[PDB]
Write a protein that binds this DNA or RNA. Structure first.
Lengths: 107, 95, 78, 93, 93, 107, 95, 78
DNA sequence: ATCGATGTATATATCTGACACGTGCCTGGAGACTAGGGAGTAATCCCCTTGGCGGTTAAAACGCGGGGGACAGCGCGTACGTGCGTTTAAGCGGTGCTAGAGCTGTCTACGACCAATTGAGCGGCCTCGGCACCGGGATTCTGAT
DNA sequence: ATCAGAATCCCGGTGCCGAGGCCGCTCAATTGGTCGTAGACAGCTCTAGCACCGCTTAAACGCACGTACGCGCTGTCCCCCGCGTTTTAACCGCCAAGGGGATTACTCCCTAGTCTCCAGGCACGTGTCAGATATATACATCGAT
């Protein structure tokens, strides 16, 4: 037979299309799962991951750090209106809060 | 030398808003968790990570509530948070 | 055990919340609020534990309780 | 007992966007939770859409619509672009 | 085109609890929506429980647990009583 | 064969056990559905419906009405703390609100 | 004869809290709905029940918001609701 | 068209909300808030319609949009 | 302005444990082929959405007088912030042991599936009684005196 | 307290239209039987949770004191309420048209299912370097004069 070529490599993705497919079939979502659905889902997940990781790496570099920590992730998410809206009701462990003091409290 | 009221408060705000460590003592919090759980089921064991998750959630919740309470205080032209402020915040939140 | 949540701790939490001045009755109010919250979460977590025929409340149980109460927590396995 | 996770893929993406930047175990756990959460949200929305339209198959259209409903603004726009590009490339082998 | 609804059963229950009381069409629509909503909530919680425990079957235990998790206080207590009584009677033919 | 006896009648219920079973099997909830699950669910649904209907009929009688309307349903739900909690994020069409005026506004 | 300020307001509160009809005019609301929908998709038709559902939801939402606004105003020792009150209510609600 | 939501209407809504006195800027604030709310709901409803390849927004579509935004409405088919 | 105290950032050196890489294996994903049924497409029909006309009346807009409520200023007294000395228990590190989570094997009860039957539930039609609209007297309640 | 006037409640009469009941039909639940498998139960392992002891030290706690802020009172003026008059457009009813939503029928291609294989990903192990800690220091900020 032919050498095994992963669906991820066929779609130019880093996320596992086969695994996503299995999770869809066994997740009690529908009776049948189309061939394009795992590819699409994997691509979306990858894009979101890339966005967050890029912003966190930028925050780390601004903090003179070379490793991303929950603090950096929290900073990246809370400083972006859209990401904050998406992750509004989510608590990041060991993330802390954004530095914010009301103007009326300043001396 | 004595710093005027407010200076040390603002310094504490800056420090704790810049830091991320948990602010409630672990052993007392654990005791509280176990005492509360005792009323639901006896001889209950607890994972360390379970207790840590509870602590993280509780602290986040309380910080958010204090933020809303502060907003209420400023709204009432005050700089001191009061129980009526907590009550207003919670009522509006739907709790 | 509720007294273990000392006044300095509540003050620290308020400081993280950006509070500059604190009334003396805030500590008792906060203790009550925390107790209610904890009771709800622990109740649900114990329900999950009992359903699993387990004797140990797990982090997953806690995570699920928070999730179903609209307080999704990241960092503890989901 | 083998426990599957998205660590490898998250790390790969990190190495693509920031070649000299690493990641802590805690942050990796956060990322894993994030991926799982988003997965669930999208899959559930697609399932609801399918049920509403009396369909038994979750397709790329259902995924796309779910993404449009959940992701706000340009997040949605770019995610849709990515998904469409990926599907096209896959369909063309 | 036949459109199923819970009208008949809601009416039976109404006639049991208030023999001389009727119901408007609007109120009937409200009741139908309510029943559907509660059904979805319970079934979804049972599904999650099953998945969490790596089980493929939704049983009376799952239903009971879902009821305890969703219904507050004495609502849950009495609902559990009712469900258990019904299951027992059914199992005894 | 034997005369058809409904599962509802076997369980002493008015709600349709068979229908509940079908909705569970075709609702993408699980692979298999136990025999007792529809019975339990139907009984719970019946209890909740009975409770609401009883309280609404009481409100109707208090209003010298013989027919239940959305107003009566709203009154019944909002005047019971537990039912209000259960149906917190729900809007009853044509239900209105509870008469409530803050004490500070009174003459 | 002139009723003192507040009497007719309280009478209106009682009347509208006792009644259940929709308070926004149907035709203007429908026009608003169609104008808003125009920006998303052209040549869109609308079911009568769709418009009615929208109206019901909007009215319920606004009533709830006015309730929270009133609470905020009273908290600030005022009896008049203001934009700052609406803003506070919405902010605390998470909107 | 937003002006069609007249001041008397907003006043009536406030009365149902238990409001006794109203500032003059409340009407414009309310109009803006309502516009935002409507935009969100209509957006989601239109998305559902387009997915169904329909040209008519249905009550069911509206209901679904409200449900997914946590504003469940009873009385219009779900 | 200004200087002094003072906390906080910043710069450098040691260590250490936690993360990034390698390895072996095994099980889940890929290649290949099959059936069958779900979804796509095309025609039809009918219902229900859109558009227009007219009247008429209820609701909205506008003007105006005034009163009461928002808001700014001021005084006071007390409660809370800051600092310091004392004490209390939290934390950390080691060690113990046993309960219970977790895995494997076996087998039996139980739920999917399938064909025939039939009776429960839905669509449609009809009618009468609950409710709504109108009008008029009774009672309540408000404000000026 | 009184009294007049305005608003609401209640009581009775008439009508009308929507809820309740009945009937035909049809398709979805029931019954009876079979078969695979999943989860219930037994038993064994070994992980980690609980209990304890001891030392240390950092955090909590109690108290003294001063002052900034909460709160009550007073005055002012402005702007929202409430009511009378004019205007306008919402609503109801009635009619016409057409477009698109729901339905049915035919086909075909797309996905589940099975088998065989093999490579990717995941426990285990390791080493080395980024960051934590400690110390000295520089620097900016707060406060009293």
């Amino acid at each position: 037979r032919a050498k095994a070529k992963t669906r991820s490599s066929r779609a130019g993705l880093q996320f596992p299309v086969g695994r996503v497919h299995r999770l869809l079939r066994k997740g009690n979502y529908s009776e049948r799962v189309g061939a394009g659905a795992p590819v699409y889902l994997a691509a979306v997940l990858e894009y979101l991951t890339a966005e967050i990781l890029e912003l966190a790496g930028n925050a780390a570099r601004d903090n003179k750090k070379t490793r991303i920590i929950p603090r950096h992730l929290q900073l990246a998410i809370r400083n972006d209106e859209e990401l904050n809206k998406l992750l509004g009701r989510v608590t990041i462990a060991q993330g802390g809060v954004l530095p914010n003091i009301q103007a009326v409290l300043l001396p | 030398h004595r710093y005027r009221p407010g200076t040390v408060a603002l310094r504490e705000i800056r420090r704790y808003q810049k830091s991320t460590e948990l602010l409630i003592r672990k052993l007392p919090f654990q005791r509280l968790v176990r005492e509360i759980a005792q009323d639901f089921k006896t001889d209950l064991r607890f994972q360390s990570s379970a207790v840590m998750a509870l602590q993280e959630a509780s602290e986040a919740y309380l910080v958010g509530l204090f933020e809303d309470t502060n907003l209420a205080a400023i709204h009432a032209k005050r700089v001191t948070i009061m129980p009526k402020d907590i009550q207003l915040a919670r009522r509006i939140r739907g709790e | 055990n509720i007294q273990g949540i000392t006044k300095p701790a509540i003050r620290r939490l308020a400081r993280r919340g950006g509070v500059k001045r604190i009334s003396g009755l805030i500590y008792e109010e906060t203790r009550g609020v925390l107790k209610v919250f904890l009771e709800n979460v622990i109740r649900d977590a114990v329900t999950y534990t009992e359903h699993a025929k387990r004797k140990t409340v797990t982090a997953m149980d806690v995570v699920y309780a928070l999730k179903r109460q609209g307080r999704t927590l990241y960092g503890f396995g989901g | 007992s083998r426990k599957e996770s998205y660590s490898i893929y998250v790390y790969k993406v990190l190495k693509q966007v920031h070649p000299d930047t690493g990641i802590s175990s805690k942050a990796m756990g956060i990322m894993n939770s994030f991926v799982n959460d988003i997965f669930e949200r999208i899959a559930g929305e697609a399932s609801r859409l399918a049920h509403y339209n009396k369909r038994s198959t979750i397709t790329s259209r259902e995924i796309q619509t779910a993404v449009r409903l959940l992701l706000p603004g340009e997040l949605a726009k770019h995610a849709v672009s990515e998904g469409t590009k990926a599907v096209t490339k896959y369909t063309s082998a």
